[PDB]
Amino acid sequence: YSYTEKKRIRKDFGKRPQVLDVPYLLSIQLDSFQKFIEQDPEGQYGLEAAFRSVFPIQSYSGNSELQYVSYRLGEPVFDVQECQIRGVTYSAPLRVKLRLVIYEREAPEGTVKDIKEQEVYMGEIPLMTDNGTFVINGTERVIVSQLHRSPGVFFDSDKGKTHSSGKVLYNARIIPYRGSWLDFEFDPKDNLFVRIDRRRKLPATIILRALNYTTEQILDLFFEKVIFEIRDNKLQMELVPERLRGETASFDIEANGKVYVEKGRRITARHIRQLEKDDVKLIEVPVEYIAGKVVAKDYIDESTGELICAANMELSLDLLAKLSQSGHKRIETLFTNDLDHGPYISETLRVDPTNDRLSALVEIYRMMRPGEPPTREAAESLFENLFFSEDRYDLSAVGRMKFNRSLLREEIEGSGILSKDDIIDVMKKLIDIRNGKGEVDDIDHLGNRRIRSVGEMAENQFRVGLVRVERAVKERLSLGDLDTLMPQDMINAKPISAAVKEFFGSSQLSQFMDQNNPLSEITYKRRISALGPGGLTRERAGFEVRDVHPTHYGRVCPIETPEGPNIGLINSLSVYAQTNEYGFLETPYRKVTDGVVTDEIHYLSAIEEGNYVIAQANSNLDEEGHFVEDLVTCRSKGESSLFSRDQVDYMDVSTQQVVSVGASLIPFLEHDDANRALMGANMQRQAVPTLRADKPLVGTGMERAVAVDSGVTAVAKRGGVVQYVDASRIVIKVNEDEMYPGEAGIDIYNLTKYTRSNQNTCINQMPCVSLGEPVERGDVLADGPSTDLGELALGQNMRVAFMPWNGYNFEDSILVSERVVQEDRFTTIHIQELACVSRDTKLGPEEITADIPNVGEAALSKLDESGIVYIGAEVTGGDILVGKVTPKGETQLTPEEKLLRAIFGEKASDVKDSSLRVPNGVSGTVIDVQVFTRDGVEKDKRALEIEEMQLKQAKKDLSEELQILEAGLFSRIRAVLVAGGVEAEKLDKLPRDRWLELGLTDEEKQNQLEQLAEQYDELKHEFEKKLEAKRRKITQGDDLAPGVLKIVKVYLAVKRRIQPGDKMAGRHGNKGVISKINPIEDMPYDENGTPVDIVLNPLGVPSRMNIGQILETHLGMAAKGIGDKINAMLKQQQEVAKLREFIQRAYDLGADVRQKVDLSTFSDEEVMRLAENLRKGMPIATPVFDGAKEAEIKELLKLGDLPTSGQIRLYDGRTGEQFERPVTVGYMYMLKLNHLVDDKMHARSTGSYSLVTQQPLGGKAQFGGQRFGEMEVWALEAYGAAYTLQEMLTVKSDDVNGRTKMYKNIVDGNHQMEPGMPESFNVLLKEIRSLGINIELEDE
Amino acid sequence: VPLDGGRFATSDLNDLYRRVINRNNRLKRLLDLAAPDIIVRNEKRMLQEAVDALLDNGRRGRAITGSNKRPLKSLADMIKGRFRQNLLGKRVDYSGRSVITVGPYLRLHQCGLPKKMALELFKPFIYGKLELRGLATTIKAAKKMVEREEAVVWDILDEVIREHPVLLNRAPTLHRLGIQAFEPVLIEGKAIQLHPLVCAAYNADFDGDQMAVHVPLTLEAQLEARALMMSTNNILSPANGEPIIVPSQDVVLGLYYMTRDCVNAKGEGMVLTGPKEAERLYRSGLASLHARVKVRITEYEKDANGELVAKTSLKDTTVGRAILWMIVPKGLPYSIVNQALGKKAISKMLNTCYRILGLKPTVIFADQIMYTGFAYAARSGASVGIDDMVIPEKKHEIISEAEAEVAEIQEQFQSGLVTAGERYNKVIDIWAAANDRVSKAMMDNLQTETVINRDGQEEKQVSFNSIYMMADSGARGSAAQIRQLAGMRGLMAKPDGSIIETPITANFREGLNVLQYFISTHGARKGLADTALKTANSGYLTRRLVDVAQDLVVTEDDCGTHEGIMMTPVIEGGDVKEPLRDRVLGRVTAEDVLKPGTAD
Amino acid sequence: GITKASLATESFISAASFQETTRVLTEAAVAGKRDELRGLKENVIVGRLIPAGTGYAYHQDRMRRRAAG
Ligand SMILES: Nc1ncnc2c1ncn2[C@@H]1OC(COP(=O)(O)OP(=O)(O)O)=C(OP(=O)(O)OP(=O)(O)O)C1=O
């Protein structure tokens, strides 16, 4: 056991030992991006691959070519912190080495000159942070990985619904990674059809003709030939004995001196037995048999040269004669069979209006570009471009794999484009499938759903960026002169940079981070989506794709999906799941060779799992790893049942591996209804982090894995001992074994301090190690928001009691002790960025001066001389943050107002008050001011105060770094210099800087001292550069938008306690809005005097069936028990042996757990530090499905001297009298969801109004009004509320005149409305009237 | 109009109007240039096209707007903007919203309005009422007063607030009860306080739901809100003359706990002068809330020609029902409370009060039923622990038995005795039966197994366990849901619609395992989707329904007809699926109805 | 059926609400059709008293002054 483990060990129940541990939870997001931006010296996906796809770019046969060499990423213009304050994107510039070649005119390719334009710049591509987010406009965004239909071929049904006859149709769809869609589909008549993209339907033989296939060859392609000989005289037929299966004779079928079947008896196996084994290849047939047969090839009259019968036409009995007498011995006909080999292509050719390649090419072109006339030069080139040009079409390797695999080919790899055989083989399968052999696939199997991510999707966007610079490159190469132009005058960066920018900025797969909370982050990054480009839209797809599918087992979570418009269109990655080599979903299993369960783990893609037999996670095995039971519940081919011991091939890796990170954090989940769990894992991410991080007494174990893997914490790079622990930073003196040879050094972690999140919440880290403490690699040096000692603490545990409380927890409401709001525990800190913008109006420029018209001297008191409030000043709503004044001249005043100007003699201002003022209702402390001034405007007074302070502050940071980093280097010079020449006291008398001169005898230590000097003088010099840069960033003229001259951002630290209206919930889908904040005295207290913190209604438990929340409240009660028991022995100060006796008892508890613990923990410092962290309650781990059992829960309650029933007798603090029946009390972890009421509350008497529709719009001051929709109108109609309705849609909204005749009448004291006509209808007059329609109002 | 940064925005019509003008002007030129007809014909065609894209773009080739891929919004689209586009809604002055919370202290006709919301909402009333009394010289200072929130504006706000109702509206406004008018009560904090009885009408939980507020400005709207939309003027649903202001849950548990009786309790057998001394016996710890007890009560009955005849007796009741009688108003029989009072019986109690005593005595009744219901429900200490969900001892027995039958149905299938379609069908039936067996096994145990003793050996009664009382009363919980906690929870359906032939043998008091929970998932997700979609289909129905009605109004007094439909009880196959008294109550007869004999 | 029965409304302003607004406006403008208001939907669209409830007394006093002197 380790160090942040010696502090606080969670007692974990559960039998099943974890064979595999949780992977790095953000792998999807970081591994994907890694491959987009990375020199990959091969064809693998990347920025390299997108380049090689469109490069080289040659001119229109001009023998002038522009090729690609290499690309580089610069360092970002600002750091991630600066990009958020300033408002910019965290991105790196893309420098791409190009080569321009010009070949000699009419000569064998040799270059006249070639200009190697060094790194032409094409756009900045955004960069992904250490944690998988992007900053796009000072806003953290995550790009959700996408689930689309896999590229390749896919055969669907379309059963039933088509044409109301049943029958079912069959479609094959060739779906590529890029390029046009090629669909083959049947019809009610068994005629074959093709449609490119989703265009018009065309007879499916046209695309074969366009591939240069004659009518004769197509027939030759899809049918076997039935040979008809005219031997001796009058009709024979070459017979395959197998041909007669499924048919009955039409005549005496006699051959070989033995009549096998007479006329009318169906040919069965006995007849095929006889014909086959007696080896009858030729027989005799009547002249009437070929009355319907379809002729295969063409035949002409030999002498005359005239056409007798065309290919694909049905012979008649006289037509037989018409070519029999013309000298034709053989006749080829088709093998047509409605059951076995259907005559589809034969009859399809008769619906085909075309006849040759050029004819087919034309009908394709005119279907694709209709209305406009086709050319031979166009019809040939368009068709070649749709599926055969390496540029306009590519399956990718994922497509060619799924393609060839589904056609039962052997290659997993091949052309990126379609060949003659590719297209034909798909038709050959779709026809075979209708013929009865073969099965369709299904859209919803996760082996035909595929997972993109950021890196892949970005590559596609940068691809589309190049294609539009390809158009421009060739455009210029059309005209170019020689040595004048260079690969720079051609390439335009704004089109490339805005394209890639639009992706990370605004995509249905790129979103905000609505609230900080290490689950929200980590669950968003593991999110999947079937939406956006390449996928379906909400309304297009029904419930079949949204549903949970047997493939989801261990790949996608069945529980954590949102409710609403895209249920099942999201999902979240299963814990142990992984993206396939090709991009499918794989899940871990354990190989079962014969009857032993191995620990060799195999990850199985969706298609792979189907054949095997996988055991269940809850399977009892012991000794050699034999299944204890004779037979185990297993799932194999799509479903689960009991199976034979020595027959299973695999076993689940973990009891968890079905659920997601969000689901895997719900304790006693197996006890919670799947409806309320979905809501549970949905509200869990919505927890705004609390002022003081608690830690869940009732936990599941994943608390560390979620906390650690999202960067909100600060984890040890290398192990060592703490040199210095500030509230600001942390210095770890690295251990030699983990320390690098040169430079030596110490790992220094600068902690994040109170800084703004993606609105409006805060993110602040705290050190969790004390001075001179040993840390190892992977320890938590500093918790973040909602982390305590390295565990996910999204809220705080509350002593809670289930009982009705005078209806103050009526529906699902919550009644809370004042002790909770006294203890500041559900307090929450928010940092709002409020900006102030001095712009450029046509009337003039705006000032930031602290001279404001018509405000008292006390109004300006909080302001400084320059007009900006002081740092640290506590402000409330209305207060002036930045005094700003805008020009408005020639006021055009009224008579009476001018008389007021002459009486009290006030110099009427040319300027209007536009100061940034604190929003009404909100209140907090100013903790930051930033000023960005457009380059050229002189930095004002306070702005220069800030520049000096920021400059001097950053000089302290950079130099404190150097000061600590010189010591760590020089300190190891001391150790190396002393070894072999020890001058213990003699050395540290001469100046320390003078040590570099001292050499050493023949040894590698002289090479080590040389190593440290090298990396020392760079630490000397890398300081100098890192200081200059931070200076240049502060003093540069901050680039602004048009018209804006300077901006002042004030950052407010609002501390928001808890109050009636705040939404709160535990982890089991138990919502609730706190309803009354109550005195500690009225709180139900127990016989001990200890009140309760929250009074929950019991009625919200049965109907809305979240039973796990109760076991939570009982095991939470036992957890607190063991805490107060430790707290007894600790305030009684027994001894380590008395403590260790009881602690060791609690960590064992029950039977057959996977825990194991101490006696080895060193008898003093260790046992005592552990007990202290437990006095608040002993944290417990209920695994997700390997959870604690009632007994182990009741047995923990006994150990704590608490009742097994988990219920006690409670007393009403009001009357003092006892409560009949025992109520439940215990500790339930409860969250605060960021639906805080002082955000949700809005009012508006009169406000602003929109220009076009004189309707309430809501900007500054009193907000927008409430919408009163059609359904609310019916309500008033169902009442008699005629007037209430009229005023609701006249004076109270659209009536520009009555609305102020109302406001004046209200203050006058006359509750009348003088209506008039809404503007909506008055505009409809002018809108109808400004069409050709005369609309009037009649009569009087 | 210009925007910030000096950038401009304009309606798309200007691209459309500009083009028509340009092509018209160019055509006017092409005539004075006497151009060849080949050109002017092409110009005329473009002028035709330009006008068409202005009036209704989309019925040709759909012109695109300048430099932007999107098409331009034509005049025709100014009117739509697809279907039902002029009646989507309009934002309104004098309004607001926030999260709503309880407030059980409220009378039926009131609601808690935040200090802050009521300030901003009535701003023009305060401004006037401020200088109407002279606390402000003029309106300009009046603003600066309520901006300063001087202590006196608060006392003024009560003046404007008193007889001035406000409107409350919750999200999906289904029937007319979705907007109800209440009298405002000035409350601290930012939450809206909602009377718990009107929750049922609104379909409001307190799990984060919000409501909106509106101010009746004109005198009419205040009287309309008071006489038509008031909370207490709509206590019956207009869909079925029954009360929509039923006690919901927390309260019906309270009354069911009161009007209950246990076999041997403190006070068993004493005789009390009246209901008053019965509350005195309970609040002093002498008599138990549920003990069989004779008390002298007086009840009233208006059997006279509109007059309350009194009758006094020693009725055979309990102590709790005695105390509840102190609330029942005047002319109701003591029999109405003498029973066990579940949500079933507790609403019909409320209905009869309206049909017998009238509106006002019903309103003040419902209040007292909630106050007392909440109080004694809170006194009850009703909770819910883990041991409250009692699994039958015979559960594992039933499972193995049906687990045996299926092993035999399988035995028959192996030998070709029974078909695969029969097997799947026959196996589902024995599992369906076993679930019914476990179900009414746990309910047999759960309901009555409280075996107690009175002066003698034994005697058992309806249980007093927490989770049973919740269901038996009707407050919360349903036997279908309870069955999923103690007994096994049903057979689940696999995605395609089949029901899975091995049901979920385990329940929620035990754990479900990976396989069971994974199968429980599809039902849950299709549950959330089905209930999400059927919330849409309904809303499209009420649209189609008001679109065919809307204009229909009670216009004439009596059309004067004898035509009418013959009303009978539905009597569906077995017995009366709906009585006659329900189908015919509240309707007016077409002609004289006669006894079994006539002349009469 | 209700949606087929709803399709037949005298007041074209009511029909231009929920039906296809082009066809209603055209087909009514060729007839020179007069909308008399009278109904609910349209009286809302134009911002006046509903011909029901408290407004029922108003329309009854209005429909009688009309077609009279
Ligand atoms: N009449 C209403 N009754 C009850 N609740 C309402 C009402 N209107 C809005 N809300 C809530 O207010 C926002 C949406 O408001 P809007 O649709 O965007 O419109 P406007 O911007 O103009 O306010 C949601 O609440 P939430 O954002 O908290 O999320 P939720 O929908 O899941 O409850 C709504 O429920």
Ligand SMILES: [Mg+2]
């Ligand atoms: Mg709710």
